[PDB]
Amino acid sequence: MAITYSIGDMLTKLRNASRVGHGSVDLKMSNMNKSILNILKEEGYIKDFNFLEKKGIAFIRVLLKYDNKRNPVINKIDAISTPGRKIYSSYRNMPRIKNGYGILIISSSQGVITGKEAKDKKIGGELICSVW
Amino acid sequence: PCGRKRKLKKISTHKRKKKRRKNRHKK
Amino acid sequence: MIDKKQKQKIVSEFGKNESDTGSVGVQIALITGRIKYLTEHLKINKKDHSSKRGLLKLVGQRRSLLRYYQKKDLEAYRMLISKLGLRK
RNA sequence: AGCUAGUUGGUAGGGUAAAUGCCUACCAAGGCAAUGAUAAGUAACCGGCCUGAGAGGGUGAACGGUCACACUGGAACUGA
RNA sequence: GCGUAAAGGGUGAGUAGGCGGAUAUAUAAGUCUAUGCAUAAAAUACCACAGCUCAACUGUGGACCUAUGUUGGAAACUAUAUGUCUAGAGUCUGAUAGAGGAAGUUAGAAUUUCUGGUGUAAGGGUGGAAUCUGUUGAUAUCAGAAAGAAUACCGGAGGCGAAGGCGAACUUCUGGGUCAAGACUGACGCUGAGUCACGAAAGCGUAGGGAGCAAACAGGAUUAGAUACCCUGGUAGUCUACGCUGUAAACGAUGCACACUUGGUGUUAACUAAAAGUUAGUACCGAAGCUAACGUGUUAAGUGUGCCGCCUGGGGAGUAUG
RNA sequence: AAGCAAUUAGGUAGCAUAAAAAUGGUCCAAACGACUGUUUACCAAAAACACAGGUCUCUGCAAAUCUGUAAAGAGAAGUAUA
RNA sequence: GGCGGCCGUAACUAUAACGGUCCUAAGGUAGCGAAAUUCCUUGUCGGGUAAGUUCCGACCCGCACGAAUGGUGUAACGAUUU
């Protein structure tokens, strides 16, 4: 099967649905996927996400958010760390994505947290993805 | 493709094969 | 061919019960039976190459299952190889 | 692309300020190697120097530390 | 970066290796932190402040990295150890399509040769001729016998297989795929350096067979010449059994696998009585996107990653040498 | 003296210790024939002949072939893989 | 069993890839070549030697090599020749 990304699969599905301009997208469900979508939700990139059922398997249905002119909120969403190339960073060397206009998402000792929260709590970890 | 490059390769191959045929049976 | 009767017979022997087809021991035993009658067939029909490819795919499947079983349940693995004759 | 036969390890002994095949006498055939042994070529090493946004690349002048050598090849004495 | 510029291995099965669903607990190797604590001699390198008339130069302090060791913590992720689940992948059951492969039998058309009748001067061939065949009875026509090779029609914007490839008919042996609530195992997976297996045609060894076709070769023509194109002949080879060779424009010039991303028009198989739709393929056009352009476009060359192979100006050169 | 022996260590003696006799000279390159063999008894032992291997051709059995005027015999108490 | 001659021709000189012509059943391909074959000849050059008509490696102007009277090589073998 070599899924190789419970993370990149959802990222790619979300990216594709967002650019074609769908209303909702329907992802596999995991603790990290939930955490990431939660961070998106606070940051105002997605409207909401719900938990569901199909054939006894749980899904996450995410409500894509666009402006009134159908320009997506997500512009570019892309992975940094990667099974063949794992990228870790200290809390000082954390990149500020696009001069802060975007957000960085990392996995740290205290859970999956945004870059600003990682800086404010003085913790660092794996660089999951960058969204702007 | 223009095919001049393929022609170049062809004549090279012919010359090399001719060399080998000439030096066959020699010992 | 391995007829339905010996198929079910080996299932009954090797599984925990009558419905336990999918367990690893049943898997390996069935593939071993297939390998045996195929090596018999290919001993005769030496220029048969599609069959040889099928045999080799079966052998690879058996090795894969054997590694998984030996890693997970070791003593069952040694009992199984000793019973089936698969050398180590 | 195979190499090593004091070569690998063991038991005693020689010797050393001191461990060790460092050396010797016996007992085994072992040891290393496509996760690169062995071989050939090149080269003193480092703190550093030059370059470059950085990562890197090249490099080992002077100065400072270590190592090796003092015509070529050996050997022991004196002595902490 | 690898469709066409140099770059995807001919194809597959797999060892080492790399990577890999959901979830619980423990370990703390990786990672992160107290930029704890030390060690990273001095000078040099960075920032200030000073002394040589300044600068170079020189001196006193202050640090920024990141490198190792160690102390106490955090645990998401990778890793380690023990479990749990089923949606991935398999086994079992049922249904079903197919030139898939191997072995053993059989068939007819057509052609050639041989034998026996009828019958006479041409046949054959080209842009035009000739060589050749024929008065030893040709060609044509009728009947019989023998051998070899290949399978019209079905037959295609098909089908199957990993690829090469596979089409007269039957049996035996045998490989793979697809669909489903239809239960079982519970991540058992992806890719894969060496290695192994297969691999059109040509070629080689041994032993047969040899109708037709046909390198080499011979003759007749075209031409200044014709070691060719054309014509008449013709030996290997083409065929069978076994053992080697392992090369192709072996091409979709596009490696494999998974998760996604508007449609139009046909077509194959299955489910459904059939339409009608779905699923798994297989073709054409085409929106967005992509592309140097050509083009590609749910069978991506689109958006992502896993692993392998390969490229770094042309000639010399896939040569010399090992 | 050790050691089962082969050898090992020490000592002794000589110019010489497989002490006598018996008991390979070796290396490099070329020509011819592959090779072991055979041949001119009595001047030629070779590069000649033979050889396994190869090709052509003959022979359907009262076979080809050979010896004889013949019968007959060999081929063969064999059968084209002969 | 057989497997040819003559003549002319290139940015000197040399040769002749090429062309013409006569004749024949067809005019010697691969490979080899002063050879167990080469008369001229102790051809020419290189190696070996202080000095090499022999020997080895080549050149090709092969009097008069040549493909089962086999051609060119070849590990091993030889009371053979050098």
SS (H, E, C) chain A: CCCCCHHHHHHHHHHHHHHHCCCEEEEECCHHHHHHHHHHHHHCCEEEEEECCECCECEEEEEECECCCCCECCCCEEECCECCECCEECCCCCCCHHHHCCEEEEEECCEEEEHHHHHHCCCCEEEEEEEC
Instruction: In whole angstroms, give the CA distance from residue B21 to residue B23.
Output: 5
Instruction: In whole angstroms, give the CA distance from residue C75 to residue A16.
Output: 49
State how far Cα C66 lies from the chain centre. Answer: 10
Nucleotides of G under 7 A from a protein CB: 30-32, 71-73
Listed residue (A120, A125, A57, A127) closest to A97, CA to CA? A127
Got the DSSP string for C1-35? ---HHHHHHHHHHHSSSTT--SSHHHHHHHHHHHH
Query: SS3 for C49?
Result: coil
Place of tokens 């859970």: A111
Listed residue (A31, A1, A30) closest to A111, CA to CA? A31
| CB distance under 7 Å to strand G: residues | B 22, 25-27
Pull the structure tokens for residue A7.
Answer: 């993370």
CA distances for A60 relative to A25, A51, C5, C33, angstroms: 8, 5, 46, 45
Pull the structure tokens for residue C87.
Answer: 């050398």
**Closest-lying nucleotide for C23 based on CA to C1':** E185
Query: Nearest 5°: CA angle at B8, between B2 and B14?
Result: 140
CA distances for C39 relative to A31, C48, C55, C81, angstroms: 49, 11, 8, 19
CB under 8 Å to A100, separation ≥6 — which residues?
Answer: A116
Instruction: In whole angstroms, give the CA distance from residue C44 to residue C42.
Output: 5
Residue nearest to nucleotide E77 (CA to C1'): A107
Instruction: In whole angstroms, give the CA distance from residue C72 to residue C76.
Output: 9
Instruction: In whole angstroms, give the CA distance from residue C56 to residue C69.
Output: 20
Helix, strand, coil content of chain B in percent (nearest 5): 75, 0, 25
Angle formed by the axes of helices C4-14 and C24-44, nearest 10°: 140
- Long-range contacts of C29-32, Cβ-Cβ distance < 8 Å, separation of 24 or more: C29/C84, C30/C2, C31/C58, C31/C61, C31/C62, C31/C65, C32/C62, C32/C84, C32/C86
Pull the structure tokens for residue A119.
Answer: 């800086």
Angle formed by the axes of helices C50-72 and C74-84, nearest 10°: 140
Rounded distance in angstroms from the CA atom of residue C30 to the C1' atom of nucleotide E185: 14
Angle formed by the axes of helices C50-72 and C24-44, nearest 10°: 150
Query: Which chains neighbour A (Cβ–Cβ under 8 Å, 3 or more pairs)?
Result: none
Instruction: In whole angstroms, give the CA distance from residue A80 to residue A130.
Output: 7
Rounded distance in angstroms from the CA atom of residue A123 to the C1' atom of nucleotide E36: 16
Instruction: In whole angstroms, give the CA distance from residue C85 to residue A70.
Output: 68
